[PDB]
Amino acid sequence: KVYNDGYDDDNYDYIVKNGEKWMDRYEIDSLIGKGSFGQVVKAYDRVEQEWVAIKIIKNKKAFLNQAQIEVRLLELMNKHDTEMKYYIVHLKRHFMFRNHLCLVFEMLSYNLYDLLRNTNFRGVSLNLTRKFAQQMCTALLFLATPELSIIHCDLKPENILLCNPKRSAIKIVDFGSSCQLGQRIYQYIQSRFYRSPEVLLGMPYDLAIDMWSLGCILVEMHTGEPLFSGANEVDQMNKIVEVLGIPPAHILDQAPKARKFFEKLPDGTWNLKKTEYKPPGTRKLHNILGVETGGPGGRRAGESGHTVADYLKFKDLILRMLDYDPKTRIQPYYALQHSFFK
Ligand SMILES: CC(=O)Nc1nc2cc(F)ccc2s1
């Protein structure tokens, strides 16, 4: 009937209660997030005298374990910052409370998804896209520190939170899906819309898959809609093929899952499988962003910094991130030196 003396529920989740005090310290305000791991509560730390976000992990061995891998990666990253000038969310401390591992983060505001909804999925300026773009890019440069070399492995608008509701500073959150570069253990990784070509094709992946996820994240922020909104891996891949073409032959010949989406004709070349979709590479990104037509749906026409010039710098950068070959796909360091950030 009852679980953990009344503090948990069916799902192994702590029952949050308006007003409750923990350890004569954290005045628990309200529930602000929810997922597989457990629940995120808003709370007032009375000692440091501030708001804090607390990530309450479910009372289960499986979630606690993945949560202790998170604590490991956060604490690691945190000691290569100390200033906090690389846009990763800060872990302040962590304690056990009623058999729940709670991770205490700095309090942040809306995530980039809530902002899209705040536009009605019509998106934000290129000037604001650029500021997420620079920050997000500096975070991949940070992660890519060889002793870190951490793959976030599930970047999306709603894993990117604004520090303040009146500033454009951003922070990446949630490192429970993350792991350090290693031999290939896992394959069903990344949220589907932002799933790399290499993942979908079952090839080996590196930090570059985070760059793909940025490329599609960056475009959806300006249009207001996913670039590649797949209902299923087949339909995900087909939408990428619309925009970028068939993947290079030397990549498909390597892929263990090449035949889930394409078929090797007798001659060596590859073509799609009939299942709707524009012919391969005919849904040109130059058009989706409205480079020569006043931006996404003509809504940016006239606005400063939204010229044809401004838009092509944006395009070419987006094309290097959505590069099919994981080794030539642009890296954080040279991405920061692209003209788009002049
Ligand atoms: C969402 C997750 O995995 N961790 C965190 N999620 C949040 C959400 C907030 F509004 C503030 C801080 C954090 S930390």
- CATH number of the domain that residue 67 is part of: 3.30.200.20
Give the C-alpha separation, 196 to 323, whole Å: 10
3-state secondary structure of 332: helix
298 carries a ligand binding annotation: no
Q: How far is CA 259 from the centre of its chain?
A: 28
Query: What tokens were used for 150?
Result: 């951490």
**What spacing in Å lies between the alpha carbon of 314 and ligand 1's midpoint?**
30
Are 296 and 323 a contacting pair, CB within 8 Å? no
183 carries a ligand binding annotation: no
**What spacing in Å lies between the alpha carbon of 174 and ligand 1's midpoint?**
7
Are 324 and 241 a contacting pair, CB within 8 Å? no
Query: What tokens were used for 190?
Result: 């990344």
Same domain, 112 and 25: no
Burial of 341 (0-12, 13-18, 19+ CB in 10 A): middle
Are 273 and 263 a contacting pair, CB within 8 Å? yes
Q: Which residue CA neighbors atom 13 of ligand 1 most closely?
A: 53
Structural resolution in Å: 2.7
Same domain, 142 and 275: yes
Instruction: Name the structure determination technique.
Output: X-ray
Strand intervals (E) in the chain:
21-22, 26-34, 38-45, 50-57, 91-97, 100-106, 150-151, 160-162, 170-172, 179-180, 262-264, 270-272
Same domain, 158 and 11: no
Query: In this structure, which amino acid lies at residue 10?
Result: D
Are 198 and 143 a contacting pair, CB within 8 Å? no
Q: To 10 degrees, what angle do helices 308-321 and 126-143 make?
A: 30
> Rounded to whole angstroms, what are the CA distances from 77 to 71, 171, 174, 175?
10, 13, 13, 11
**What spacing in Å lies between the alpha carbon of 299 and ligand 1's midpoint?**
32
The domain tally of the chain equals: 2
3-state secondary structure of 183: coil
Q: Which residue CA neighbors atom 3 of ligand 1 most closely?
A: 174
Q: Annotated active-site positions, please?
A: 154
> Ligand 1 pocket by C-beta < 6 Å: which residues?
32-33, 40, 53, 55, 89, 105, 107-108, 161, 173-174
Same domain, 61 and 116: no
**What spacing in Å lies between the alpha carbon of 62 and ligand 1's midpoint?**
20
Query: In this structure, which amino acid lies at residue 5?
Result: D
What atom of ligand 1 comes closest to residue 108's alpha carbon? 11
Chain length of the chain: 342
106 carries a ligand binding annotation: yes
Domain holding 49, by residue range, is: 1-81+89-107
Please enumerate in sequence order all residues whose Cβ is within 8 A of that of 64, keeping only pairs 6 or more positions apart, or say none: 57, 58, 101
Q: To 10 degrees, what angle do helices 308-321 and 208-223 make?
A: 150
* 132, 138, 144, 150 alpha-carbon torsion, rounded to 10°: -40
